[PDB]
Amino acid sequence: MSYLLTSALLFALGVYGVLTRRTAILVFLSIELMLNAANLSLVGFARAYGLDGQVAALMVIAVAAAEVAVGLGLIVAIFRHRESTAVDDLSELRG
Amino acid sequence: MAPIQEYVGTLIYVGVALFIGVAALLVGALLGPKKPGRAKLMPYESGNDPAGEVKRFPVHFYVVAMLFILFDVEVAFLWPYAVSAGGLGLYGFLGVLAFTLLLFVGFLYEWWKGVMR
Amino acid sequence: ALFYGDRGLLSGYFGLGGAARSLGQGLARLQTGYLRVYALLFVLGALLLLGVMR
Amino acid sequence: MSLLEGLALFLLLLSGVLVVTLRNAIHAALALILNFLVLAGVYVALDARFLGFIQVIVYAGAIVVLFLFVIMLLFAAQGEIGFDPLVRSRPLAALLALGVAGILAAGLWGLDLAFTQDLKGGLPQALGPLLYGDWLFVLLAVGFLLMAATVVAVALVEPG
Amino acid sequence: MTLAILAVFSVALTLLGFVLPPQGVKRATLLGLALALASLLLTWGKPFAFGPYAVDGVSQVFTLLALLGALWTVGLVRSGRFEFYLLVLYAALGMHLLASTRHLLLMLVALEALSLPLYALATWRRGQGLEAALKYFLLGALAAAFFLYGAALFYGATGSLVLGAPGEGPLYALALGLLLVGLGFKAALAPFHFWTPDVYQGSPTPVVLFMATSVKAAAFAALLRVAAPPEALALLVALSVVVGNLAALAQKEAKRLLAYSSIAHAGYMALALYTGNAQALGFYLLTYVLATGLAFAVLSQISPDRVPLEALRGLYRKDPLLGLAFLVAMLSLLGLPPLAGFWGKYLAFAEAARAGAWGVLVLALVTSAVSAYYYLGLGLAVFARPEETPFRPGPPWARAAVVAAGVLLLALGLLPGLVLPALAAGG
């Protein structure tokens, strides 16, 4: 049970990272940490409910890899010619 | 399966290896003249600019690494079929064949487009 | 006098419409355009929902 | 258990704190790799062994390797450039983190579960029939997703 | 066996584009989408399940809507990159998978498969487009993390990852909330709405057409599977509709204003979720998809990058049919009789009142009357004096598409007792 609470804590940590980080890449890293917290909760509940959460987390890892590929390609495309990645540098779109 | 005792032995193995590595680092660091000089600390190649000022490196390495993560996910999925094979029969063979063919079509697209770029 | 009073009543109706518009532009000002701002407001709304669920 | 289990959980939490605190991107990534290692060890302790091994291979071995490749191509290690500091946002972010932890803690509080099932080790020997089978359709969807991700990134960089 | 057609065409064209001109690849994509739609029609009343994949009335109706939106948005795009069609095909298959399953994890995989190609399709390379794509990707990955932890808490509260399981108290409520966060962000409900104005303003107008039709359709299809509590539903609807219409009042740009209007419309559709009738919602979404596709096809004929409000003016004098269809779309999005948008609105409100949510329904109606301000400032502006504005009066392709959309709107507004009888099993 301690594992599920630890996963919730890691989720909160990744949230703090996403909110605090100035860099898009470090935001994405905090998101990956959130994903792995979810995977740990899944593994605990798979130990509880019979191993299906294991295959679940496996598919999750695959999905995470795909989305990491896509998001890093996007990050590179946006900040290859452009200077420092700081996401506050893009404020053109306003209410 | 296998007992956890071998995994504890694995932990022991790692602890022993790390301890030996730290011992080697202590000997190397402690036994030395220790005469720092400005030119000695200077990176390389006669005054400045071994690499000097160069803009961001080619994305070729990024492409290789991303390719690698995707195909490593592929291999990670191929392993459970590699172990549990005879029981999954022609149906499991066909499912894994479909998975492999999808990711190989992705590879063929990225190849006929190529990354020398 | 009653005519002018009716005119002023219609003007107050206009004032109510403008108060609605002002509220709307304050809510549009809520979107500054900074992703950090958008994400903070997002996490805020999500926690609000999870609390309301009880 | 609890002796070394508490140790492993403290290591996980500290690694997360580092990855979200440190302003050096390389240092944060390294903290995250340490996190993934401790997490795979916890996986093994939780009878999920193959999943821990794939967590090391794909996530640590491949994913954050690509991350490191990206941040070494685009230096970015000293992230605090172009600040727009919004100092008021740091305590608000800490507050939102504490709240998202507390609501989950409330949802999981007073919650006890039957953690007694013979997973037999999360070995691929026993995971295969689930993956190819009940999860075969999800597997095929994942593979299609991966192919789509390849084409997406390829057309996404593609200078022309 | 429509998913089979979709996957076959996508995988084949992936390599075929090497030997085929992008025009031929576009023709092929159009043919495949039309063939999948024809199969959906011929399978009307033939629910088909293989794994967690399940085709029922909901799957049929909502995938029909998504296929229509994809066909329309592909018709306009003439770029010589066959990848700009590969991504649309991928997104279509992903939204079909999203609408056709109850498995939470397969739902996540389908979500990623449909969302990733849109991030790339949002790149006309205009500087605002990259900002839009960045906000979209970051907020989307955050919501994916939240949905995944909700699925984990669902697997915690019950032994399966499939919806419909009995469910616990507070923990099940927590899991349901963590799933609802992601689902509403994808449905542009406030207070998760912030991404929508920026993304609609930054993305190319035909892409925004594709989004505002197919994405919203599939999102509400997946929402109907959740057992959303009434208090949470009330909060979402109130905030969404209020903020949407109010902030839309302040908008100077057509795409951003339409984004806020779409936030308000998602707030409206969330009422049918009280009962989850899905016939009312199927009809509502049919009407809304047609109207929005029409409006955005016209906005694409005007300008792909950005269309200001004044650009809409003189549209009648330029093309009378286009001005009239744009007016009809504005009215159907306002939800006024005798239009099918009104019938969808009425069906959603009837589901809500049947659920016994009165104050929420009243607030929704008040905010909908507020929406008439800008709905009329758009529809009626068509008749104003033409100012300096780029205008390319479309091909017969887009002309006939817009006209057929408006005609279907008005016809199903006058006689909804034709199609509405078959949004259930389909007799």
Side-chain angles (χ1 to χ4, degrees), chain E residues 32 62 183 220 245 256 281 289 314 317 319 343 405 419:
Chain E
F62 289 77
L183 291 146
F220 272 109
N245 300 290
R256 199 171 187 91
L281 206 54
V289 157
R317 302 172 176 78
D319 197 327
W343 283 121
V419 285

Side-chain angles (χ1 to χ4, degrees), chain E residues 226-255:
Chain E
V226 189
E231 318 84 357
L233 229 49
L235 176 56
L236 302 170
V237 166
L239 259 49
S240 299
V241 191
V242 171
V243 177
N245 300 290
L246 289 196
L249 285 179
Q251 294 315 311
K252 39 144 74 182
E253 197 271 316
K255 300 207 291 171

